[model samples]
Target: MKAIPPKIWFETQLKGSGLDKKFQIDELIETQSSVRVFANKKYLPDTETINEALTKVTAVNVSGDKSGYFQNGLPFPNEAGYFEKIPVGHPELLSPIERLTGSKKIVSSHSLVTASGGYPLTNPLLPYRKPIRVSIFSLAGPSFENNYLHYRLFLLDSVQKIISPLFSHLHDGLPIQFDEAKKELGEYDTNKLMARIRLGFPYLARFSSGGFYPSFSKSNAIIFLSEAYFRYQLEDVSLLLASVNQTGKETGKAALLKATAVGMGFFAKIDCGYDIQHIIFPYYLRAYKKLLSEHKFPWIAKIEFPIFNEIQQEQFDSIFEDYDGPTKVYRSTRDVLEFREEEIEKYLPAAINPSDAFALTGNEWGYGSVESMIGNNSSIRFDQVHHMNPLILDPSHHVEAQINKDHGVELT
Candidate 1:
């Protein structure tokens, strides 16, 4: 019996653990918890391992339109300003899942959009409308190795506060799409597109404890695009798919059937690390299924090409072989062994699905980096002229810049 790797859309990653990995249930002070972690796993170079190749990973900007444009931008008029600490009188709406198993640690440092003090500033762009900004910050492993206990406690208290009465029901249709369409922005309407967003990102309420508002869902991520990223996703996914192939585990196989079904069942299940894996599928799947199913999607310009299952399958495999193995990541960045060939290929450097990009770029917690992109303009002196910051004009306005005294930046 062997495990089947789940299908990945944009970039899927599979890690082979030479180290000891364990998944278990732990009983805490009056609470039951589940912990998953690995130990003593040796890192392998992604370049040499995947298909014995590595490519540069590129960064994708969903924030503003400019490729290198950096804006603290104009604020949105209608958006909620910040996440507030819920009041005590609110009814208890916290879920058992969030209460028992949640991480209070903010994964990305820049993600602190709404501190207990309130949103950093009224959308600087719009005096009236609350500004929406996204950045990633993670918990430093050194200080917070077992901080899960604090997170669970915080969630138990904060989840109820935010949701009790503060929950606002946004009109269901595609109001945001209307704006997208008007702007000629990107993919306007797509069912699977909406499915990705609905599957994971759930904004829960804060349970009031002392004054510190607890943030239950915290993940530090960067919308990084690079040759390296593509290779990683390709390798990991390939390996995962290959592992099933090597093991001869098909959908009909006993163990794989159970694992695949379980993985699919839990696809976009919206836990913590689980949620990160959830939205990623469409990047690999949308274009893929589009090619396989009806033959096209909004992202692709015209009818382009017809669906060919066999050709697409081969192309998928070959692409994985190119970037599957161990390679150095950015000179000094540590190396990692890719268990699944196409894991990172499907995990990082994603395809820009219509609405999902919006959710990723604008959400309270930032998935991609605006600062990093802006920094690129200065970092790569040679190619800076060739690079165009297309994101400068897009909706995020993240790259819009303002000058201060001495022609410096006053407001971004």
Candidate 2:
């Protein structure tokens, strides 16, 4: 059997490797071009990436809302002001799949009003009647390649302090006496704030809400959505997903099954540098059943249980033909390759379902090689708008198991 290309490869190297050459980035604006320029520099900001993610999310809502208005702005009832309103099901969620298959629609889905944090959900400062809020931050940090797209991640306050300093206050306007008080009091310790707060050196933490205030999560509620995100690693790990949610307690796992299925659709539509070949399902029996139920989830509006089975393998093969080799991915106990021509099985790990593996195909971006996405060098230009490289996939050794264990509670 052929070895599957690691997810990290796609997250980091695929775009530059030439799989997406047939399709080109949309020329919506000057900054939106393949080579993202920002602040007249070659740097991509966390805010820009978050904004891009926000647009992708907002597009789903705009496409799903047939009535022209969100049923209720927030996912849940929050008389509070901190919550950011995100939508449930929308056309863009399925567009990745549809665009690849050239189909009209795949599933009828929508979004729910849920809590996204700017503070810890357990904060005592919250209103009694209001739902708990948690602070979630989209962090963009320096990449291995100084000028390439920055690395992006959505993290909660619980782990925020461990990695970087989440808050910073300048003493510029403060009383000189106060500054002396802190320095003389010797109470303020002096280690250069944490890594999490540093903005990845050149990059900074871009909160979903304005300011450095905390975002809270009321409960461990997992609101399902049809969105996807491509996340990279610190050194060289990379991961991709259709959708994911973050909460208070600890790091959450990849909404793998749904994420991968969505990823397959997305990869199909894009001109990636490689083709998906082998997939790995890490979930056990219990998790598999839970995934099956989610597939038939009633909230999707139009019912399509086992969405994987509904997929037209022949069509997928044709659309993904961009990858020429025979591909395969497997679950904990079996090689799902046997079913490659058929619908995926529920027992397989949900994360590994659909197209979990990819094989390289040496395709290039329509406009140019993947290298154009990063541009020529690292020197920053002061006037242009720059974007995080969406192409970089870094090292990810334990991502599979770690994500699963983290979100297993809600997912399983």
Candidate 3:
């Protein structure tokens, strides 16, 4: 049996910026990969259909198929393994590929990439709360370097609040080091490539509630847009801010806050550097604290920032203080630099020692053994630093470290 081809839709374009003239493509003979079109819904051809198409086609839509969805909420890569047997012709052979992609400018398919982790409907950015339909599509053009997969995500939050939709790409998990120093200082030195890869790790949901917190909901939206919409290596900060603000206007403050919070976490997790720790983390703590103090959702603080101590707790609180009064300086630079380095080092590789590492990297505290508490819950004793003790300075062992908490030490 021949597989049912996917659906297609065309978007009207404006030409020449004159008289607000709306130009439409009534009947086009050939499809332009560059044109902004979309292949809607899932297109799963049967054994015979796929077999025939495989014989005729050299190209198909591709994406990160192993993962159902990316952290930013776009579909995992599609057309990934479909074209293995066919010859690589014309980059894309229109005849067989067109049916696979459909009339939409973007070519894509829809299916449960993972059976267990369904849509994450509890997520706020999705159309779950207000009952709207979300359409995921794949794109052909806007080609990527390194043969990455690209996708477009469209969300209709409500009848009145349908977003313009977005596009995102899947990047290979490879470290592209900093260039300036590698050229200027010396290519042989590892120090030259010290600049870290930001936004590399896949962010998992902290806790599953009915949906994302309002702060997270809004910030997540912005994060996806930054990844998908803004097409520049160095996007304009002002324009990005403007886009976020406009999204707030369109979606609502709740949406804005949620997107903002998620965006902060995404940025923080990207490099785990000083800016994220000192600036973004504090900012996150301050914003969330205010939200909690305002009684937005007291439970949110725990899910967002899991581990904290009395000292850390006080530090988070101090961020909201009014500077008009006398500022009490508590901890010395030793505690700041030492503990801060400890916090981030857990996420780095285990083989690295302090001398060869950046920041004040060490693990003397023994993986949260110092004792930390969350919120006002003194009963809950969190072995604060115990989770990922990457550089096991005390006594390094492959057995316990690798078996128990494998994520404790990663090479990247």
Candidate 4:
């Protein structure tokens, strides 16, 4: 059957002059900033149809279908609170692929196309508490991990291989690389063509029920996950746009479109990245508006760096410190990123391994002893230095790395 309509929406937000405009400071309404033309909630699915549609899309929508866990909330990669997919002797854990083939479930998927240890099912952004609350019941995180959730990972690989040639035709000279880097590394380094596919492994959910704790809410887990990814990549886009050369309108616009396509490709479903062509302006616009009002860039560098003082930072923090509890993922994603960066930072410093102070669980998405947390990922690590990238990231370019004292490890 054909998929549901791609619900479109419109939202007008405060667009200040200068750098503020570029950052889309007025896009997201929850960014703790107020803006004009905030026309949100447009083209959204009807309230009544929401439940029915979500149910219908369950097989494909949930983050993990086989394991029933969402990646954003818990089951961190570096830690071990998560359930093992192919439990030592559990017969059920062995899906058709594992049984038919002698390989473990993780190896069969090839999830680590992005980094040293594979990528997480979701990016490592803090979850926002607002959206998860409103869309509580229908959130779907666990589905994303289940092999049978929809088009299981191996099936996705089979399909991708079949249509590989057809898609490659579109980019005349684009080369393709899947495993070992004996082929496409040099050119990849010359041109900054790179992409990282991030997916969450087993997801975990936690809510305030008096005592600090976590709950296994599959749907809410997925919601928190899917949206957190949107937020992280949008930040990357904003950063990239901030560095754009706007001198040539047409050239700049074209390049921007290509960049956006690459960004969107990271989340393309099992077999539909080629046909999905969205301007993505709506998403960017929302993020832009939020940044503007929250940052208050008006008086200072209304044109470039609108000064957002530390006091405003603390003020915004007060507005979003506490979450209403298990709401919609989108809302929570916005609040945490928009207003609580300070707190998020407290969690981030522990990101690269030093302390478990951030309650972070590294994503498991690679080859070797580390299992593929999400998707088919692979990596290389020796001397304790590990790096993995998404297979989908710059699939055509080959990667080469050199360890230099000054630059550390450089991917060329």
Number of the top TM-score candidate: 3
Best by lDDT: 4
lDDT of each model, Cα atoms only? 0.20, 0.19, 0.20, 0.21
Tell me which of candidates 2 and 3 scores higher on TM-score. Answer: 3
lDDT of 3 by residue, 298-361 (tens): 1111111222244455665576454221211122212101112232222210000101000011
Ranking by TM-score: 3, 4, 1, 2
Worst 10 residues of 2 by lDDT: 104-113
Q: What tens digits encode model 2's per-residue C-alpha lDDT throughout 1-412?
A: 2223233323343345332232223312221221211110111123432223222321112111211111112232233221122222332221222111111001000111021111112312211122211111111211111101111111222212111111111112222222232233242222231112221122122233322321232111111100111111111011111112211112232211222222223222111221121110111111323333333221111111122322233334333334222112122222111122122221211211121100011111121211111111110010011122322111110111122322221111
Q: Point out the higher-scoring one by lDDT: 2 or 3.
A: 3
Give the least accurate 10-residue stretch of model 1, judged by summed lDDT.
32-41
Tens-digit lDDT track of model 1 for 331-398: 11111111122332222211110111111122222212222221211111111111222221222321
For model 1, the superposed segments whose C-alpha errors exceed 4 Å read 1-287, 296-412
What overall lDDT, based on C-alpha atoms, would model 3 receive against the true structure? 0.20
Candidate 1, residue 228: Cα displacement in angstroms equals: 32
Using lDDT as the measure, what is the rank order of every candidate, best first?
Answer: 4, 3, 1, 2
What candidate 2 gets wrong by more than 4 Å, as runs, is: 1-44, 48-52, 55-65, 68-260, 263-311, 315-412
The Cα error of candidate 3 at residue 154, in Å, is 27
